Design a binder for this molecule. Structure first.
Ligand SMILES: *[C@@H]1O[C@H](CO)[C@@H](O[C@@H]2O[C@H](CO)[C@@H](O)[C@H](O)[C@H]2NC(C)=O)[C@H](O)[C@H]1NC(C)=O
Lengths: 228, 104, 298, 118
């Protein structure tokens, strides 16, 4: 008996603005005639939950709702109560899931200088700091082109050490250090809900970072007040 | 070839940058941040009220302008301070810089 | 404007650009050759009685400034001793041309909306729209203008319109397909002549709007056809319109919560035959639309 | 309109200071000028103005002057001065310039500029 209900995630929400909720039923009795029915807080029916699933490898028929709703219809605590009646359940088992802040801070550290002497691994670090809540999604963008999802590796939002309850996660990515001569700043696209446009992109390249050759060049004249 | 990190035409600052792609050795290059300022030592502190003292300090929190009290007349957008004239009194406009306040 | 004589009319033509070591790199040829960086944004008119002709280049970039040569040769390239004509080019970079989006992404069956700028002073000209053609000496025929002429193949799914009207107008094109991909040019009848170019890419998915397919109908009744919209179009105003050379006009009082703006036709004649569009507004900008054709039976 | 400050010599006769508002290279004739300081106008009996008369070099452009007399301590007080000109080739019809002790021919340049966070 394992029947968990999946609340929507800002990953898919950012993907297609398609907040979705599923309450899959698993390891129950092995019978057909399985019905899926979700309800809002008025109790009314739902949309095209479809695409039947076969018996599990452990020989139990698998079924799950496919419930699309409105992003606005999620923000006031709607206990999405889904019922499933079955042959074994004259008392069908119900499932529910509903809607249960701090700004993130994103940086992008360049590789290490000693990293850039082995002459293969160009590590790059993007990051996020001190934010609430979790569920945030991140990804890296390279010239308007999302990278290989396996190319980077994403953390999970473990909580802050000293902050009251804020969150932070990480992600790391490698490339050829020979590539760390074209650079192209490898833009890491954060995606958090609590942003004015829900994206706080930042990026960093070789030319960015820190130089060790200044040349300040103040000039001085009456022939000014102009800023050509 | 340089990359203008900032070009603040009302402070006459211009932080560029340029990677000095070295002699064709391995990646022992150093990036390079040129800077440039043309401080006027002629203007007011209220850039748009020529009845104030001149200026002594010129403070450049580059952090602030790596992104409003800035002190060069920008060439393109022009200024003015309504100024009394007497022919009787009249409180009338001016054009504190020419060749940019031309309604054309 | 290249101005060679009639004495090389049989001979091909070319256009190169000066480089460092006395070496033109060719940009387009009478032999159909064309530089890959300049793909799309180059035109070439046919040659005149004197062989006079012109070359139109749109969307110039910072490295495009320099010296240019147009000539006539059997190989259509540079050689010693062949007639030439020179130009020196400069790109401003202190420009007033508004930065408009250059690439516009759409899906098969979807819509596209394109903002096209022009100089604000000649707003009473006749806008045009042309499609670039390769695999040729390069061609670009018209597709639509502002009086309302439209190419004969696209009845129903295409309209342009002067909603913004401050040197910017909007174009709406729905029912997108992956075969339509390419480069599009915008034209004007003004003396100054911007030719802004936009590329349409086609990606995977289904359009956000949902409307039933092509449907037949009986004469003289009441019929309703729906149009639901996703939650991202929920912050707008919604409308239906009837497509023609005049374009859209909405029909006020057909609504729900954030879905299902539905058209209703109290009585119908065959004069109401044609395509209808369902779309949303961005305050004073336009968004996604979708189309459906309706027949009349008895 | 340039605006020349009083000669240091005149500052040593120790009473009176003179400032020369100037206009140049302009057409047609009949510029108008007055002097303005601290937001209060200066009644014309302080200042005297020239009339046009052609440039030696410019075939067409006239010029003019204006002169103002003020106690040196008054000019030593700081107390800047602004001479305004109105003339029908000037964009908003009216430009002007100013000078005090510090602007005009200072012996002293005291910049104290700070440049933080290179
Ligand atoms: C000091 O500077 C400030 C702003 O830099 C001036 O403030 C306004 O300036 C505009 C300019 O057109 C005037 O129209 C307003 O009347 C000004 N407001 C106030 C409260 O003065 C200010 O004018 C400057 N100082 C003086 C004495 O003019």
């Amino acid at each position: 008996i394992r029947v968990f209900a999946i609340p929507p995630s800002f990953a898919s929400i950012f993907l297609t603005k398609s907040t979705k909720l599923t309450c899959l039923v698993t390891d129950l009795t092995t019978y057909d005639s399985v019905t899926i029915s979700w309800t809002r807080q008025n109790g009314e029916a739902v949309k095209t939950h479809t695409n039947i699933s076969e018996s599990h490898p452990n020989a139990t028929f698998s079924a799950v709702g496919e419930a699309s709703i409105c992003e606005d219809d999620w923000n006031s605590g709607e206990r999405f109560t889904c019922t499933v009646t079955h042959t074994d359940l004259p008392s069908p088992l119900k499932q529910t899931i509903s809607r249960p802040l701090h700004r993130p801070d994103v940086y992008l550290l360049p590789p290490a200088r000693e990293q850039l002497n082995l002459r293969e691994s160009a590590t790059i670090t993007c990051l996020v700091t001190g934010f609430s809540p979790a569920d945030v999604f991140v990804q890296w963008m390279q010239r308007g082109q999302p990278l290989s999802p396996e190319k980077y590796v994403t953390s999970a939002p473990m909580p802050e050490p000293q902050a009251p309850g804020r969150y932070f996660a990480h992600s790391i990515l490698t490339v050829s250090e020979e590539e760390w001569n074209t650079g192209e700043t490898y833009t890491c696209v954060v995606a958090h809900e609590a942003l004015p446009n829900r994206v706080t992109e930042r990026t960093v390249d070789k030319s960015t970072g820190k130089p060790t050759l200044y040349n300040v060049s103040l000039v001085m004249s009456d022939t000014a007040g102009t800023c050509y | 070839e340089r990359i203008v990190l900032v070009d603040n035409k009302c402070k006459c600052a211009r932080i560029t940058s340029r990677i000095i792609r070295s002699s064709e050795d391995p990646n022992e290059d150093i990036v390079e941040r040129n800077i440039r300022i043309i401080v006027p030592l002629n203007n007011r502190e209220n850039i748009s009220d020529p009845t104030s003292p001149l200026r002594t300090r010129f403070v450049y929190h580059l952090s602030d302008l790596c992104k409003e009290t800035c002190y060069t007349y920008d060439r393109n957008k022009c200024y003015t301070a309504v100024v009394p004239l007497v022919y009787g009194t009249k409180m009338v406009e001016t054009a504190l810089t020419p060749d940019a306040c031309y309604p054309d | 404007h290249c101005a060679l004589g009639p004495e090389v009319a049989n001979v091909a033509k070319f256009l190169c650009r000066q480089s460092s070591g006395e070496n033109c790199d060719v940009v387009v040829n009478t032999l159909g050759k064309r530089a890959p960086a300049f793909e799309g944004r180059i035109l070439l008119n046919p040659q005149d009685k004197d062989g006079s002709f012109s070359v139109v280049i749109t969307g110039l970039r910072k490295e495009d400034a320099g010296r240019y040569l147009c000539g006539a040769h059997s190989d259509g390239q540079l050689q010693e001793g062949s007639p030439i004509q020179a130009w020196q080019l400069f790109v401003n970079e202190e420009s007033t041309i508004p930065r408009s989006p250059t690439v516009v992404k759409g899906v098969a069956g979807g819509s596209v909306a394109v903002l096209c700028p022009y100089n604000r002073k000649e707003s009473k000209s006749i806008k045009y729209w042309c499609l670039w053609e390769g695999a040729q000496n390069g061609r670009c025929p018209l597709l639509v203008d502002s009086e309302g002429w439209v190419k004969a193949q696209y009845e129903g799914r295409l309209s342009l319109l002067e909603e913004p009207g401050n040197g910017t107008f909007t174009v709406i094109l729905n029912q997108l397909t992956s075969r339509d991909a390419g480069f599009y040019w915008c034209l004007t009848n003004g003396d100054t002549l911007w030719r802004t170019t936009v590329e349409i890419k086609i990606i995977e998915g289904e359009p956000n709007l949902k409307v039933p397919g092509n449907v037949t109908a009986v004469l003289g009744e009441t019929l309703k056809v729906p149009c639901h919209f996703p939650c991202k179009f929920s912050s707008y105003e919604k409308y239906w319109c009837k497509w023609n050379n005049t374009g859209c006009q909405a029909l006020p009082s057909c609504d729900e919560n954030s879905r299902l703006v539905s058209l209703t036709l109290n009585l119908v004649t065959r004069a109401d035959e044609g395509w209808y569009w369902c779309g949303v507004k961005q305050g004073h900008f336009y968004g996604e639309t979708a189309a459906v054709y309706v027949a009349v039976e008895e």
